[PDB]
């Protein structure tokens, strides 16, 4: 279910970031296999090539993670009633 074209920023970037978030949530739930499967589903890990799009997606995921409290935390506990 790949999205065509990389480009600087579009809906494909949002899809990639959502996939990264899902793989990271799998890793938090302790599943290396599904996270690696999603990672391979987007970019081959046998490549040592510099991927500015990959680095930018990782950096944006990190920015969102550090600027927003993570899912399933006591901050959600008082956010819900």
């Amino acid at each position: 279910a790949v999205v065509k074209d990389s480009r600087p920023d579009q809906i494909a970037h949002d899809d990639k970031t959502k996939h990264l978030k899902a793989a990271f949530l799998r890793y938090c739930r302790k599943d290396i296999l599904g996270a690696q499967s999603m990672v391979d589903s987007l970019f081959s890990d046998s490549d040592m090539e510099p991927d500015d799009e990959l680095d930018l997606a990782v950096n944006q995921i990190s920015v969102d993670l550090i600027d927003d409290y993570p899912a399933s935390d006591p901050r959600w506990a008082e956010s819900v009633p």
Partner: protein, 62 residues
């Protein structure tokens, strides 16, 4: 930017033509002793959205 080397036959002047189909761009090129047909992805078949405010964009060659 792409460079195609038809090493054997020099490309005839006025021998490059382009046709459109709802899925792909068909490039028909005639030389002195050879004829070639190439298939290229269509811009709309490579997804179409420029909602994001950008100055540069990826082309259809990756």
């Amino acid at each position: 930017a792409v460079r195609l080397k038809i090493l054997n036959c020099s490309i005839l002047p006025g021998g490059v033509h382009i046709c459109e189909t709802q899925n792909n761009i068909i490039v028909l090129i005639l030389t002195n002793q050879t004829v070639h047909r190439l298939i290229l992805p269509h811009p709309s078949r490579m997804y179409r959205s420029e909602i994001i405010s950008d100055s540069h964009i990826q082309s259809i060659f990756t």
